[PDB]
């Protein structure tokens, strides 16, 4: 309903964007750059801030990868072929396979980019999906998953009403939107496997925030939420 206002999620999306030099480094820097933005976007989602701080920390640490992935996957609609980073950087197939991340690249294109493109997914829908991903009650260490759950299904309800209102010609658009979650999860895990492998070597100049997200106090994330 109007308790989790979909338009507020939309402007939460709009407030955080308007837009082989070791492509691995590039992706890491892009991610790090987008983690602070991810914190702000998080704080812009209704009720996320009136949760226990540590619960916010938990949700963000559990969802950050999937969230960023959804973000750039939706950004790469505009371009024909490849993946558009938040640093205005266009990563293509050849370098992705040359970087040893070709498979996950292709899977991201087909499962996310392609699907988001054909389905004509707008940004309030994307924001609702990412909000759903964010409010995951099954995360470890949650002081209380019940509120998180309520929020998740509020986003759910708002999104379903939104799809009913906006796309009456597409009766099964909502289910199709929700159907992306398992695919996104596998992609997220598979990206984590990489980030850990690339970090294990130390080949790539990883950055502070990303390193904090990859390690399991922590400092940074706990700071950016006090504001």
């Amino acid at each position: 309903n109007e308790d989790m206002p979909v338009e507020r999620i939309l402007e939460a999306e709009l407030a955080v964007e308007p837009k082989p030099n070791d492509p691995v480094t590039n992706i890491c820097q892009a991610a790090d750059k987008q983690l602070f933005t991810l914190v702000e976007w998080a704080k812009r989602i209704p009720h996320f801030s009136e949760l226990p701080l540590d619960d916010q920390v938990i949700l963000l640490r559990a969802g950050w990868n999937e969230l960023l992935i959804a973000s750039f996957s939706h950004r790469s609609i505009a371009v024909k072929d490849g993946i558009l980073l938040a640093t205005g950087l266009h990563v293509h197939r050849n370098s992705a396979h040359s970087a040893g991340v070709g498979a996950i690249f292709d899977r991201v294109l087909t499962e996310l980019v392609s699907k988001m493109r054909d389905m004509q997914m707008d940004k309030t829908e994307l924001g609702c999906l990412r909000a759903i991903v964010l409010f995951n009650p099954d995360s470890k260490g949650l002081s209380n998953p019940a509120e998180v759950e309520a929020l998740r299904e509020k986003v759910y309800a708002s999104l379903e009403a939104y799809c009913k209102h906006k796309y009456p010609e597409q009766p099964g658009r909502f289910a199709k939107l929700l159907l992306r979650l398992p695919a996104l999860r596998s992609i997220g895990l598979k990206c984590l496997e990489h980030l850990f492998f690339f970090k294990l070597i130390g080949d790539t100049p990883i950055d502070t925030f990303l390193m904090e997200m990859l390690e399991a106090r922590h400092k940074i994330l706990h700071r950016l939420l006090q504001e």
């Binding site: 087909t110 099964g172 909502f174 289910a175 929700l178 159907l179 398992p182 999860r185």
Partner: protein, 294 residues
């Protein structure tokens, strides 16, 4: 009920396949192995972590009412915690064989190229297996009641064994009180998954998956009390989402165990790729997907 003819056709089909390929009494689970009457050390600690939380008592009833009850050993320092692995392997193989039969009976799966059948089954085996196990799982007493067999979870003092994503998954899936149609629909969704590594007919698999998802959504919409069950689809989707994590982590865990202690059946070795082309890489799987010779 309240669906289009094609949707009800899908449901009737899935129900038929489940019915024909899922022995819930486990009467044909026979001749299974029973438990007998530097980095090495670190990884060893890892595998130990893996097993410590997943300990079960093996209850076995007889024809006449006699019940043999096995209890696993407390963790020491060697093989004594790898005692159920052969049995677990046999059970897993039986279940997998059942899953393959299930996939075969379905028409849509049967119309797909053999390579895509291989890929889909590889990606969804453990998931479907887990779902079916949730079908016979007793959340009340924390036991898997497999007809004659029963796998009861071992105490520790419950709230701390939900720190294992699999057990928590079984409890949380069993809390949902699903109908058979919903279970088999979940099985259908996870089975027909386009994101799976080696799929070629991505189009068809995608169309099918979306159709099954919409069929499920509509089934919840029409065959359950209106506002009591509106977020049910959301919970089911969350389940299908965590199922992925469970699958990946189970794969790597099984890998870590097999690495220092081989136990897994050839079919398991194939379903998890333990050592190309798809058919030579999965000769057993591939053989099971062709009929007959009965």
């Amino acid at each position: 009920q309240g669906l289009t003819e094609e949707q009800r056709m899908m449901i009737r089909e899935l129900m038929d396949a489940q019915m024909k390929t899922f022995d819930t009494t486990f009467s044909h689970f026979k001749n299974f192995r029973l438990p007998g009457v530097r980095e090495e050390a670190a990884k060893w600690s890892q595998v130990r972590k893996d097993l410590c939380s997943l300990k079960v008592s093996l209850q076995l009833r007889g024809e006449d009412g006699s019940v043999w009850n096995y209890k696993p050993p407390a963790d020491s320092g060697g093989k004594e915690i790898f005692s159920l692995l052969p049995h677990m392997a046999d059970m897993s193989t039986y279940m997998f064989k059942g899953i393959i039969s299930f996939a075969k009976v379905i028409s849509y799966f049967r119309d797909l190229p053999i390579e895509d059948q291989i890929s889909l089954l590889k990606g969804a085996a453990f998931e479907l297996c887990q779902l079916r196990f949730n079908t016979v799982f007793n959340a009340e007493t924390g036991t898997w009641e497999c007809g004659r067999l029963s796998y009861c979870l071992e105490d520790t003092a419950f709230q701390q064994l939900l720190l294992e994503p699999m057990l928590k998954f079984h409890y949380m899936l069993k809390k949902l009180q699903l109908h058979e149609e919903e279970y088999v629909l979940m099985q259908a969704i996870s089975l027909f998954s386009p994101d799976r590594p080696g799929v070629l007919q991505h189009r068809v698999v995608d169309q099918l998956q979306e159709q099954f998802a919409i069929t499920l959504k509509s089934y919840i919409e029409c065959n359950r009390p209106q506002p009591a069950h509106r977020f049910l689809f959301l919970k089911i989707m969350a389940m299908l989402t965590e199922l992925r994590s469970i699958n990946a982590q189970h794969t790597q865990r099984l890998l870590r165990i097999q690495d220092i202690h081989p136990f897994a059946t050839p079919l398991m070795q194939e379903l998890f790729g333990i050592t190309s082309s798809l058919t030579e890489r999965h000769k057993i799987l591939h053989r099971l997907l062709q009929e007959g010779s009965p």
